[PDB]
A paper describes a structure:
Structure-guided engineering of pH-responsive anti-PEG Fabs was performed to generate pH-PEG engagers. To engineer the pH-responsive PEG engagers, we determined the cocrystal structure of humanized anti-PEG 6.3 Fab (h6.3) in complex with PEG. We hypothesized that the conditional disruption of the formation of the h6.3 Fab homodimer/PEG complex under low pH conditions may decrease its PEG-binding activity in a pH-dependent manner. The pH-responsive protein interactions typically rely on the presence of ionizable amino acids at the binding interface. The protonation of ionizable amino acids at low pH conditions could induce intramolecular electrostatic attraction, repulsion, or hydrogen bond formation, leading to decreased or increased binding activity at different pH conditions. Therefore, we performed a structure-guided mutagenesis of the residues corresponding to h6.3 dimerization using ionizable amino acid substitution (histidine or glutamic acid) to generate pH-responsive anti-PEG antibodies. Several h6.3 Fab variants displayed pH-dependent PEG-binding activity. Finally, the h6.3 Fab variants that produced an absorbance reading higher than 1.0 unit at pH 7.4, while decreasing more than 25% in PEG-binding activity at pH 5.8 (Clone 6, 9, 10, 11, and 12), were combined to generate the pH-PEG engager. To determine the pH-dependent PEG-binding of the pH-PEG engager, we analyzed the pH-PEG engager at different pH values using ELISA and included the pH-insensitive wild-type PEG engager (WT-PEG engager) as a control. Figure 2B shows that the WT-PEG engager strongly bound to PEG-coated ELISA plates at both pH 7.4 and pH 5.8 conditions. By contrast, the pH-PEG engager could strongly bind to PEG-coated plates at pH 7.4, while its PEG-binding activity decreased at pH 5.8, demonstrating that the pH-PEG engager exhibits pH-responsive PEG-binding activity.
Here, we developed a pH-responsive anti-polyethylene glycol (PEG) × anti-TfR bispecific antibody (pH-PEG engagerTfR) that can complex with PEGylated nanomedicine at physiological pH to trigger TfR-mediated transcytosis in the brain microvascular endothelial cells, while rapidly dissociating from PEGylated nanomedicine at acidic endosomes for efficient release of PEGylated nanomedicine to cross the BBB. To further boost brain uptake of PEGylated nanomedicine, here, we engineered a pH-responsive anti-PEG × anti-TfR bispecific antibody (pH-PEG engagerTfR) platform, in which the pH-responsive anti-PEG arm can bind to PEG in a pH-dependent manner. The pH-PEG engagerTfR can noncovalently couple with PEGylated nanomedicine at physiological pH, followed by dissociation of PEGylated nanomedicine in acidified endosomes (pH 6.0) after TfR-mediated transcytosis to efficiently cross the BBB.
Author numbering:
A (entry chain B): 1 to 217
B (entry chain A): 1 to 129, 135 to 214
The structure:
Amino acid sequence: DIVMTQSPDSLAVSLGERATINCKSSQSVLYSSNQMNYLAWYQQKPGQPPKLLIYWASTRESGVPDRFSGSGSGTDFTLTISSLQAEDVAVYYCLQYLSSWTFGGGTKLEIKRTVAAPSVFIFPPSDEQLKSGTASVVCLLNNFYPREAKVQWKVDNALQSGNSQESVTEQDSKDSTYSLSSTLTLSKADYEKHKLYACEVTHQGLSSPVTKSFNRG
Amino acid sequence: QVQLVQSGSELKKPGASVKVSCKASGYTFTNYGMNWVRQAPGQGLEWMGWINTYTGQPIYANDFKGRFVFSLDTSVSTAYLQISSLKAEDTAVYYCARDWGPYWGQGTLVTVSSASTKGPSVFPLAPSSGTAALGCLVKDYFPEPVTVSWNSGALTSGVHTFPAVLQSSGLYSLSSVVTVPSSSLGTQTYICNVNHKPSNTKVDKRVEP
């Protein structure tokens, strides 16, 4: 029954600026006897276990850079990244360990950078695929920011609904951009009933939309 | 020195049971308690409970009584998590985490599904027509995950591997791509190295204009 509540739930901060995450406990995690706060902070990147950054509220774990610090006491706590760096993109969790363990809900930290136009590319289905008889047309947006992007598929300039699935990479830890793959899927049949396959893209890094098309063979 | 090493991924059908192991080394096993932690895909960390590694006495969080049992084999310094009557929503990464300090397992993916192991099909996304993008499409594999490198991991710069998507077939699919100089295309070779361990499907497709 110690509830941990982190805020905000997600946060975008500019490279070089101060990132601040808050954790609040529903009861004190300060142990009277030893004046220690039983609170830790963790950084989790995808595919990995969480990695401990801070414990006893303010003690920095070995090997962790000086830009991370923890402070606060009792029931209110702060994690501070003094000067954010591209590699800091991650989910951050507080943990109380005074009375059992309770993790906070986690805080997704992203980097805020300058607008960046996507590089659009289109890729027709392979011959090898079409033999088994399905068509996967792949549109790729590459190295844009921000995340927001629209991808409309056009077959003979007929707008497509319900047959494309999108997917977005995590923010890249070196240059702070996203990439987005859209796949249009059709039976071999339907792919033969049409000619011009196009994907049209909308963004803020574009005064007007960008198309890439091919003609079926 | 200190290491917590867990067992490998598991695909289970609803109703069955599973037994994840966590083998500790580099310290006196029985001097430190062991925690279990569950992370459902895309979700937060959630404490499952603790085991006293000296007495064997397990303590369970409120949300994990009934189907969950913690046990030890002190003689090989190993903690075990046993989940019974598996449901789809027990699909999660499970972690062992030691009392006091930074030590976590690498985690064990448990997937609960009726569907069968099925290896992908790999398909090039060849370049054509400054910079030219090329890639691979990895289609109709189950379950997650798959890995991808470029040129046995010589080309990592510029690489972007995409999160899988679940298609309405109930099979996964994903693309991996990379942008290169458009002069390099004739001269330089590009191979995407694809691995799906659940079905042993390992593939080194070449990609050319």
